[PDB]
From Swiss-Prot:
Name this protein carries in UniProt: Protease 2A
Assembly information from the UniProt record: Homodimer.
Reactions the enzyme catalyzes: Selective cleavage of Tyr-|-Gly bond in the picornavirus polyprotein
Organism: Coxsackievirus A16 (strain G-10)
Signal peptide: none
Transmembrane segments: none
């Protein structure tokens, strides 16, 4: 579990969104596994605006932050899971590292701020839903 809290937005994995998220919806995209809902209080996270390929992510199944090298956001094929059928998840970055359901939500961050959240992984893999192209998260 986990979210990004930037401005009056809460960024979560679409597959983990609650009823309150859907009832206060700003934007959602199934192909990216992302959903954004509105918040009453202002958040403290800042979004990175960059093309970094090295950063650090939080792994809840280890209680640890790990430094990683990651690929650029791409259309990577994701295996059928209980949440989506086999399809091209878009805007996805891969790195070598542990992940278990449970781990989706953990933040990946670079020197500029938050880059994205955990969304894929297994066999020493860990996918990250990028958010750096969502410029509107910084305004309204
Ligand atoms: C089987 C895929 S996985 O990488 O563990 N993961 C499970 C939860 C959903 C993830 C997604 N982003 O589609 C895929
Ligand atoms: Zn960066």
């Amino acid at each position: 579990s986990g979210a990004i809290y930037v401005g009056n937005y809460r960024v979560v994995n679409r597959h983990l969104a609650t009823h309150n998220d859907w009832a206060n919806l700003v934007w959602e995209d199934s192909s990216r596994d992302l959903l954004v809902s509105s918040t009453t209080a202002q958040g403290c996270d800042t979004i990175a605006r960059c093309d970094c390929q090295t950063g650090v992510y939080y792994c809840s199944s280890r209680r640890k932050h790990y430094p990683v090298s990651f690929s650029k956001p791409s259309l990577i094929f994701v295996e059928a899971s209980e949440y989506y059928p086999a399809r091209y998840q878009s805007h996805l970055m891969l790195a070598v590292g542990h992940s278990e359901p449970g781990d989706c939500g953990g933040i990946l961050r670079c020197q500029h701020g938050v880059v994205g959240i955990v969304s894929t992984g297994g066999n020493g893999l860990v996918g990250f839903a990028d958010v750096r192209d969502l410029l509107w998260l910084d305004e309204e």
